[PDB]
DNA sequence: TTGT
DNA sequence: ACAACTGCGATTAC
RNA sequence: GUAAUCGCA
């Protein structure tokens, strides 16, 4: 019913997998719950499973994230216990635990964490028929039934008719003899198995049977079956069918099964793995309802059903689950576009899924089934290539748990249209073609000829027997593919980089929308829920940064804007007003603009002049030289906000003291303390100083200080006290530090298109290069990366760029525009450039001789450049990783407990790490020398280390170390602990004497 | 030419009860023997302090804190004033407290245990060197059975004679009685044995020449007509000469080794020391508090009564072994014996063993200090030897240096006051750092390091910013773009590193790859496009001129710096075709062809054209000039080409 | 990277620590052999010690113990010369270590590798670099 | 490199002495490795 | 490619290396126990199987290495083939 | 898994 | 039974 | 101090 006019919902999968979950899952659950009746008296207790009724949370999402606590619901269910003695059944609501609920976004809120539930992709049940070619001989036929417990019950065929099931680990085992154990007698199996001739002249139970619904299905649809969906078990005449195409594939009359096909897998969603978590819960709550029946029967007390049940099972299972399960991750929000790019995700490993060495080449690569259905250019790059992927754009989770696509039925019938979201098995049977009608040869359309696809192949055909048709352009990509302009341009292998990249960039502190874009980006802003959109109509009467009154229908609602945020990945989230005062708002508009979101379109960069071309080397490689413009005007600016906590955990001899007052430290410090042991808000803080200080009595001085790097202002501090653990906890002291990051040398800046670069250097604006305007270009890129990155379509997006500042136009354009003719972007950027050239008499943004190309000038000398280079403003972003984050330095500081090596870790303070790759270099080399110092005294080596500061300030000379390092000594201990000796035992060749080093 | 000799041997071997006793007994002042774990308690509750003749006692191991000791009266090693080693009161002893990580201790086993690598792995020495086979001592060690005869050096009454006893349902309590109790527990240990005392006097009471002699007859008799059967048969007694042949090699080099087989059982258990396993608690340590237990229960059912049932202590004693083998090697059984939350034990093997067992992750690969690590940036104004350094790395990496420059010159009076006007970034401490690190050399260093060139030394440049620079002809080397990669950089400490790292490891020393003697060094992207244009050429054919010069190149140029002059005043263009005068050298290159033209006038001098060049010459056959046709580009190349030949050779004198 | 490591491992040990070992054996390089590649011939002779001397005639084009180069190389194809004998690591007299000649000419520099070189690494990484493409 | 607790016990039940000729062995053991300037000539 | 590199210096088998050089070596091994007696036998066995694996080990690296247009020294190559083809089996016939 |  | 790239950095969970 | 997960080049 919807999303077959229009881009359905990015967070729809995982809102409609809560749904279906809390609709049936909850109940489907609680009916299998077993009666306890653990007693000679048979004292039985029961919960009404019809009596089932969610309650609203007590605290809101906005509570529970400041103050670190689950957003749940209240399972209460009315329980009736039968006493012994009393011989009645006593009926009260209980309060089973609480249950987890899902923001309209699709994350959860566990613990004030935002954490996202990542679809799993696993084999469906059902019979496999793969075959293996033996080394000599005809191949081998094999037949797998696949059970939803993961029950493999193999059939083999050799050269003889031998139908061999491999369920024991010994050389076969006789069909027949199953059959007859099955329950057939010999005579109705022969008369009901088709070529019973091959059969009679031959001459755990309930795991392996527990087929889920759509095994039943799928086993019925391989082998035809008339078995009713309802009896999901593993039937004899299942396996005698299964037998019999068996032996059938041996005489040609067969196929094989492809297990990369879609139609085989199924997708877990949010809702099975809440299912199965609930059931858990549910076993754990009846082990502990036993327990404390058997408890009160000790003590010979009859309890009313509440003091039975404990809400403790219930929300530990969904804690540990939203804890430490796999496929529960923490929300990335570096930028809107993460937020849902990281719901899309479908992965093959997890929990009862190919691990990263398991999977095989065949797993990672694309099968014609993936059309529509998963996106081919976004894997994640690394060991786990092929096995983490995202979901179409168009694609929609089945009543079957299969992924279906939308596809147009041009076949005439009395509607003439449809959109009908085809299953992965079902489009394979008919002619499916993405290409347009706009061809006539004198003869009938329908006898014009188009590329299709038919039973996983390509072949041309007539327009007559073409079925159906792919008419959205963004139904075989994903939201990262997506945004990318001109994407027909270049090459696929950039479109993953580019698609990785654009998760990469940061919020700046203004935001600018782009010239030239897909189209997507509103939608991408709608769906990411850093946007204000009213659920009410009204008018805004009153307008305020922390809140904004909606009157509507004689009531007033207040929405709050957020102002000056964290995230998770240290990226600040604010929002602005976009409507005025007194202004009509329907039900869905956008109040307001969040963070790298500008006019309702998502924004995660700017636009700035750029020329390709080399410019003394500073662009040599990847690197790009700009100008002081974007500094001393805040182009790239950003805010990155860090948090610093530390608990005042009260230990039994002592609890934590906060005192401002601490001896030992000197009176630079400690004046941006309070009365209190805590920063001040508004306060300059820098690197070494103190943030919160405390006695600490068990006195010592466990404070908090300010690591390198850390140079912000205190915007807030939190004094969180803890409670709910059952016991008093330790306050928590949260400080925030806000540090505006400007542009400089070595941050790094991407382009849409696969462009990634390092700055190198920042000229001024009067040594830059000036076109004929007179303007300095911002950028200056390598022309040398097109031909080596294969990058075209960033040529096309400078030029409409330029056309478009000049013209104050900005151009959404849907990818594949060559669909209606040749050299469609080629014409469309050619006519906007002409036209700004003339409507703006400047003559060379178009220039007849070389289009898109212009003629500029050298800032230094002022003499032109001989051959012309491309100007253009394309949409530059600024990314996250940056110079100051990576800048890292070790003097000599700190040691590990065991290892006595130095600590690893940036912020820890740790040196680099010399492996063996570089010790293999070194000794090639051949500075025994440097080798021996790194692997002693630099490294290891307590008492060498300790004479080397001593040696360095008094400027003597370093003695080679002679004693063996502290690993070798370690070694020794630890083979002698496994009663295994090591002595050096060094021999003198001058006298002949064995003397031992220890 | 007489070598240096060094001669250097590592040795192992199996170690005797005895050494692991004497690697942790020790006499205190008063006359005790300290050094036996006893208690699985490892620190007190709610106290924090080392329980006594515990996995952390104080006594046996070692005192935690220097010069402090556990009674509570701190003491000074090495005073003038006498002081005893240890206090009366408490065993621990008034020492620095470096001895906890290298001192080692020892559990008594009051029943012995087989070691795991030398029982359970597939090639078995117990069952090499004993022919029993292994599963009959697995059955043996684990599983409830006797061994009738496990002595053969003293007399036995008994004729049992048998390998494997299934049951002790043989006629035991009529024996006992009949023998008085004590003389029946004298033999039996000459009679039927079980567990772990049968393995070790057949390993105890053993002749290996005997043993190599059988094993010698043996193989003689076998392989007469083996082959001629079956390949089952052969496959047999190959693998039983297999066999023998190993059964020789272990029994000749237990014979000339110093080393016992006796010590295959272990009598007695190390115990690692404390802070190599500090206690956040370790899996090491509770195995051990497990195999503790269960050896002091053991313990006390042995001291209990004699008239204990043999049922609960043989199951203690398999429990023993059980938990010996789990910390030993766990896995080689297939047994995982995970925790308390489905987590399977590490053990010493899985410690040594692995990627990131103890050798790979801790002696072949360690971490540094002086190290920092950042992005990587062109600096296309630098020279092969020199790269842009920041100062912010640089600072931390040279503060040693800047310390002792600050209190040798009168800027700072102490290492902290220096400290402080280094932190506060006073100018002077720049000028110092800048002036320290002038003839100091850095290595750099990636990542990938596949080739040897991945590390090189250059010369450190202060540069303000965060972004190390980096030559652009030396990427090529460290397989670097500048799109985001990071590197390290490492400081010489020492003379004879400073000297290894100015001398060999410098990139004008290395300027040909080791595989096949190439320039790895060479322009590459922008200069090699520069070279290009430059010497690429002029339209020569019709796209110079539109009509045949039949119906009807002109600048002459004495010098090529003439010919430079007039393209920096954009008289000429780059391209554009002119002559240049040469002085008699005649080292242009160009095809073997004849002149396509040559005037000879009446006076006798001839003119001879060729493709690129005009010779003139006179009736003497003398060169009166050359003139070659050429571009600026060329003849800039040569010129920059040369002048750097002869700068370099001007600037050696 | 996994086969870059093990090769090292088994050449790790050979350094250069003699001028000569004594060897009068040398492995005998023919064109006509392997169907005469002139590239490949060249780069086979090019930085190899000479065993034995080469006679055109009364002449001796180069004599024994001496590093063979691009004009011997030149000279040699010129005059055809038959089947001549080279040093190499194979005709060495040791496993755990090699000598100057039977090496060669060293690849860093141009000349002979000198006592202290390992370069049983360097050949593990000269074989391992180029693994990628 | 491979197999360290076969090849350990290997060499413990049997004794085996090694001379520090390689390059590894005096890696592990912390010293001057005996090529180039560790080379003694 | 570099699989078939990884293939030719761990031997596996001697037909994977080659079918020639096993036809070849198990031809020598199976005539010169006839030929040059007990003595003369074994060791000239020995050096025409170094030689023709040595070349037949280097020539196969070499093309594969070629082919894709590596170019190597032959000299590094055969450190590593030394090692390999540096080792001797005794027949479990001698026994002293 | 893949092969050893 | 054994092994299957090198390191770095970030987070949360124990 | 160890894991899990992602990223980096
Ligand atoms: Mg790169
Ligand atoms: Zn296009």
């Given amino acids: 019913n919807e999303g077959i006019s229009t881009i359905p919902g990015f967070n729809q999968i995982q809102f409609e997998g809560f749904c279906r979950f809390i609709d049936q899952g909850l109940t489907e659950e609680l009916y299998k719950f077993p009666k306890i009746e653990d007693t000679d008296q048979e004292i039985e207790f029961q919960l009404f499973v019809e009596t089932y009724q969610l309650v609203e949370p007590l605290i809101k999402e906005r509570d529970a994230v400041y103050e670190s606590l689950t957003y749940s619901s209240e399972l209460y269910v009315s329980a009736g216990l039968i006493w012994k003695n009393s011989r009645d059944m006593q009926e009260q609501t209980i309060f089973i635990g609480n249950i987890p609920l899902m923001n309209s976004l699709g994350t959860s809120i566990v613990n004030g964490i935002y954490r996202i539930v990542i679809n799993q992709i696993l084999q469906s049940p059902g019979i496999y028929y793969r075959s293996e070619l033996d080394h000599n001989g005809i191949s081998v036929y094999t037949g797998t039934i696949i059970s939803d417990w993961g029950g493999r019950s193999e059939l083999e065929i050799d050269r003889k008719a031998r139908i061999w099931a491999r369920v024991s680990r010994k050389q076969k085992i006789s069909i027949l003899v199953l059959s007859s154990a099955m329950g057939l007698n010999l005579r109705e199996i022969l008369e009901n198995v088709c070529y019973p001739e091959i059969f009679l002249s031959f001459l755990f139970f309930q795991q392996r049977c527990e087929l889920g619904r759509i095994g039943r299905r799928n086993m019925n649809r391989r082998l035809n079956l008339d078995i009713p969906q309802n009896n999901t078990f593993l039937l004899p005449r299942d396996i005698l069918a299964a037998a019999d195409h068996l032996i059938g594939l041996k005489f040609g009359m067969g196929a094989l099964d492809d297990m990369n096909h879609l139609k085989n897998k199924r997708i877990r969603s949010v809702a099975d793995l809440l299912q199965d978590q609930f059931g858990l819960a549910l076993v754990r709550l009846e082990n502990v309802v036993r327990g404390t029946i058997c408890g009160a029967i000790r003590h010979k007390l009859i309890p009313t059903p509440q003091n039975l049940v404990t809400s403790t099972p219930l929300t530990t299972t969904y804690e540990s689950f939203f804890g430490l399960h796999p496929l529960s991750q923490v929300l990335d929000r570096t930028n809107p576009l993460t937020q849902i790019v990281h719901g899309r995700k479908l992965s093959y490993l997890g929990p009862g899924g190919l691990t990263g060495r398991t999977a095989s080449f065949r797993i990672r690569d694309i099968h014609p089934s993936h059309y529509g259905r998963i996106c081919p250019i976004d894997t994640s790059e690394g060991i786990n290539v092929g096995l983490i992927g995202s979901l179409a754009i168009h694609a929609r989770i089945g009543h079957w748990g299969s992924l279906e696509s939308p596809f147009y039925e041009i076949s005439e019938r009395s509607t003439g249209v449809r959109m009908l979201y085809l299953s992965p098995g079902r489009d394979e049977y008919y002619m499916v073609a993405a290409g347009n009608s706009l061809a006539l040869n004198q003869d009938i359309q329908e006898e014009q000829v188009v590329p299709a696809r038919y039973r996983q192949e390509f072949l041309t055909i007539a327009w007559e027997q073409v079925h159906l048709r792919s008419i959205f352009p963004f139904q075989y990509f994903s939201i990262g593919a997506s945004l990318i302009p001109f994407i027909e341009h270049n090459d696929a292998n950039r479109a993953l980089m580019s698609s990785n990249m654009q998760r990469q960039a940061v919020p700046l502190s203004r935001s600018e929308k782009c010239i030239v874009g897909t189209g997507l980006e509103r939608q991408a802003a709608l769906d990411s829920g850093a946007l204000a959109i009213a659920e009410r109509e009204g008018r805004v009467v009153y307008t305020n940064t922390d809140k904004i009154l909606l009157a509507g229908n004689g009531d007033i609602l207040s929405i709050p804007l957020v102002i000056y945020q964290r995230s998770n990945k240290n990226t600040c989230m604010h929002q602005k007003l976009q409507v005025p005062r007194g202004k009509c708002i329907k039900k869905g508009q956008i109040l307001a603009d969040g963070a790298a979101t500008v006019g309702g379109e998502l924004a995660l960069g700017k636009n700035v002049l750029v020329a390709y071309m080399p410019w003394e080397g500073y662009n040599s490689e990847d690197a790009v030289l700009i100008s002081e413009r974007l500094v001393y005007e805040d182009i790239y600016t950003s805010f990155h906000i860090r948090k610093y906590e530390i608990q005042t955990h009260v230990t039994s001899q002592g609890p934590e003291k906060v005192t401002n007052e601490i001896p030992h430290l000197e009176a630079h410090l400690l004046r941006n303390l309070d009365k209190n042991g805590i920063v001040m808000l508004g306060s300059w803080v820098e690197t070494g100083d103190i943030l919160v200080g405390k006695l600490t009595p068990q006195s010592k001085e466990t404070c908090l200080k300010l690591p390198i790097g850390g140079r912000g202002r205190v915007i807030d501090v939190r004094w969180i006290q803890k409670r709910g653990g059952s016991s008093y906890n330790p306050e928590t002291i949260r400080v925030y530090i806000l540090q505006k990051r400007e542009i400089k040398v070595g941050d790094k800046v991407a382009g849409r298109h696969g462009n990634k670069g390092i700055i190198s250097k920042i000229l001024p604006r009067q040594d830059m290069p000036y076109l004929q305007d007179g303007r300095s270009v911002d950028m200056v890129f390598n022309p040398l990366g097109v031909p080596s990155r294969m990058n075209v379509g960033q040529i096309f997006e400078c030029s409409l760029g330029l056309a478009g500042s000049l013209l104050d136009r900005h151009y959404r354009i849907a990818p594949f525009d060559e669909r209606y003719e040749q050299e469609a972007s080629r014409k469309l950027v050619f006519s906007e450039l002409y036209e700004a050239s003339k409507q703006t008499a400047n003559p060379w943004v178009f220039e007849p001789e070389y289009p898109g190309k212009s003629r500029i000038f050298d800032g230094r000398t002022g003499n032109p450049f001989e051959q012309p280079v491309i100007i253009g403003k394309p949409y530059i972003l600024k990314l996250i990783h940056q110079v100051d984050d990576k800048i890292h330095g070790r003097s000599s500081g700190h040691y590990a407990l065991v290892t006595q090596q130095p600590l690893r870790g940036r912020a820890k303070q740790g040196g680099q790490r010399v492996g063996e790759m570089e010790v293999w270099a070194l000794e090639g080399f051949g500075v025994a020398h440097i080798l021996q110092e790194m692997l002693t005294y630099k490294s290891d080596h307590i008492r060498a280390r300790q004479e080397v500061l001593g040696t360095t300030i008094i400027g003597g000379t370093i003695p080679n170390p002679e004693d063996a390092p502290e690993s070798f000594r370690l070694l020794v201990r630890e083979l002698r602990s496994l009663a295994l000796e090591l002595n050096h035992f060094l021999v003198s060749e001058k006298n002949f004497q064995i003397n031992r080093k220890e | 030419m007489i070598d240096r000799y060094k001669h250097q041997q590592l040795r192992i071997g199996s170690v005797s009860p005895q050494q692991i006793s004497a690697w942790a007994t020790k006499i205190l002042p008063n006359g005790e023997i300290v050094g036996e774990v006893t208690k699985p308690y490892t620190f007190h509750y709610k106290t924090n302090k080392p329980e006594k003749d515990g996995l952390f006692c104080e006594r046996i191991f070692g005192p935690i804190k220097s010069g402090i000791c556990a009674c509570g009266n701190y003491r000074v090693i090495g005073d003038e004033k006498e002081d005893p080693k240890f206090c009366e009161q408490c065993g621990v002893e008034f020492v620095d407290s470096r001895i906890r990580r290298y001192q080692m201790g020892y559990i008594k086993l009051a029943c012995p245990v087989t070691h795991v690598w030398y029982l359970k792995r597939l090639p078995s020495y117990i069952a090499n060197l004993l022919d029993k086979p292994l599963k009959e001592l697995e059955g043996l060690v684990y599983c409830d059975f006797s061994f009738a005869r496990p002595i053969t050096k003293k007399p036995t009454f008994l004729r049992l004679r048998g390998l494997f006893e299934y049951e002790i349902q043989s006629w035991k309590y009529s024996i006992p009685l009949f023998f008085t109790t004590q003389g029946f527990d004298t033999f039996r240990n000459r009679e039927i044995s079980t567990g772990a005392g049968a393995i070790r006097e057949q390993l105890a009471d053993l002749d290996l020449r005997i043993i190599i002699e059988n094993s010698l007859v043996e193989w003689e008799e076998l392989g007469e007509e083996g082959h001629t059967g079956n390949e089952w048969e052969d496959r047999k007694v190959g693998r039983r000469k297999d066999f023998l042949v190993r059964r020789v090699e272990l029994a000749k080099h237990f014979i000339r080794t110093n080393i016992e087989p006796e010590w295959m059982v272990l009598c007695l258990l190390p115990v690692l020391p404390p802070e190599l396993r500090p206690i956040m608690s370790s899996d090491i340590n509770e195995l051990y508090r497990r195999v503790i237990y269960r050896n002091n229960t053991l313990t006390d059912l042995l001291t209990t009564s004699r008239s204990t049932p043999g049922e609960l202590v043989m199951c203690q004693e398999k429990l023993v072994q059980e938990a010996v083998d789990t910390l030993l090697d766990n896995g080689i059984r297939g047994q995982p014996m995970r925790d308390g939350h489905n987590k399977v034990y590490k053990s010493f093997s899985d410690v040594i063993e692995g990627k990131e067992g103890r050798f790979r992750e801790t002696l072949l690969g360690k971490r540094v200090d002086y190290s920092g690590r950042s992005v990587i940036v062109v600096g296309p104004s630098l020279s092969l030897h020199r790269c842009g350094l920041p100062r912010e790395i640089a600072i931390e990496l040279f503060q040693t240096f800047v310390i002792r420059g600050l209190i040798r010159q009168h800027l700072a009076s102490n290492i902290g006051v220096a400290k402080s006007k280094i932190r506060e970034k006073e100018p002077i401490v720049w000028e110092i750092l800048q002036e320290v690190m002038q003839g100091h050399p850095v290595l750099l260093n990636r990542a990938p390091t596949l080739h040897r060139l991945g590390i090189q030394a250059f010369q450190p440049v202060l540069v303000e910013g965060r972004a190390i620079c980096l030559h652009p002809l030396v990427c090529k080397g460290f397989n670097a773009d500048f799109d985001g990669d990071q590197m390290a950089v490492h400081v010489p400490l020492s003379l004879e590193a400073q000297v290894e790292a100015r001398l060999l490891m410098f990139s004008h020393m290395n300027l040909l790859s080791p595989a096949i003697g190439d320039p790895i060094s060479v322009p590459t992207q922008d200069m090699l496009i520069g070279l290009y244009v430059l010497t690429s050429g002029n339209h020569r054919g019709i796209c110079v001129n539109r009509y045949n010069p039949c119906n009807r190149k002109e600048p002459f140029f004495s010098n090529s710096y003439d010919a430079i002059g007039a393209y920096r005043q954009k008289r000429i263009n780059l391209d554009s075709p002119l002559w240049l005068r040469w002085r008699l050298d005649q080292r242009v290159i160009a095809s073997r062809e004849t002149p396509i033209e040559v005037h000879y006038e009446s006076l006798g001098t001839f003119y001879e054209i060729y493709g690129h060049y005009l010779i003139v010459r006179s009736l003497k056959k003398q060169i009166l000039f050359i003139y070659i046709r050429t571009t600026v580009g060329h003849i800039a190349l040569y010129r920059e080409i040369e002048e750097a030949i002869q700068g370099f050779s001007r600037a050696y004198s | ?133 | 490199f491979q197999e360290t607790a076969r090849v350990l016990a290997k060499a413990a039940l049997r004794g085996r002495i090694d001379w520090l000729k390689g390059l590894k062995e005096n890696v592990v053991l912390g010293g001057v490795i005996p090529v180039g300037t560790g080379f003694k000539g | 490619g570099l699989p078939k590199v990884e293939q030719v210096l761990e031997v596996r088998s001697v037909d994977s290396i080659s079918m020639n050089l096993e036809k070849r070596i198990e031809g020598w091994n199976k005539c010169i126990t006839r030929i040059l007696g007990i003595p003369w036998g074994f060791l000239i066995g020995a050096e025409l199987t170094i030689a023709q694996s040595r070349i037949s080990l280097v020539n196969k690296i070499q093309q594969v290495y070629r082919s894709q247009g590596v170019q190597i020294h032959n000299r590094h190559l055969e450190i590593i083939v030394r090692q390999i083809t540096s080792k001797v089996l005794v027949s479990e016939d001698g026994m002293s």
Avoid: K
């Fill in chain 3, 1 to 133: 990277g996994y086969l870059t490591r093990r090769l090292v491992e088994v050449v790790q040990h050979i350094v250069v620590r003699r001028t000569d070992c004594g060897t009068a054996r040398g492995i005998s390089v023919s064109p006509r052999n392997g169907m005469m590649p002139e590239r490949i011939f060249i780069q086979t002779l090019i930085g190899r010690v000479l065993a034995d001397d080469i006679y055109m005639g009364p002449r001796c084009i180069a004599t024994r113990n001496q590093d063979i180069g691009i004009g011997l190389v030149n000279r040699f194809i010129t005059f055809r010369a038959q089947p001549i004998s080279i040093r190499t690591p194979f005709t060495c007299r040791s496993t755990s270590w090699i000598c100057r000649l039977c090496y060669g000419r060293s690849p860093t520099h141009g000349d002979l590798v000198e006592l202290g070189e390992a370069v049983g690494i360097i050949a593990g990484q000269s074989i391992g670099e180029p693994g990628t493409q």
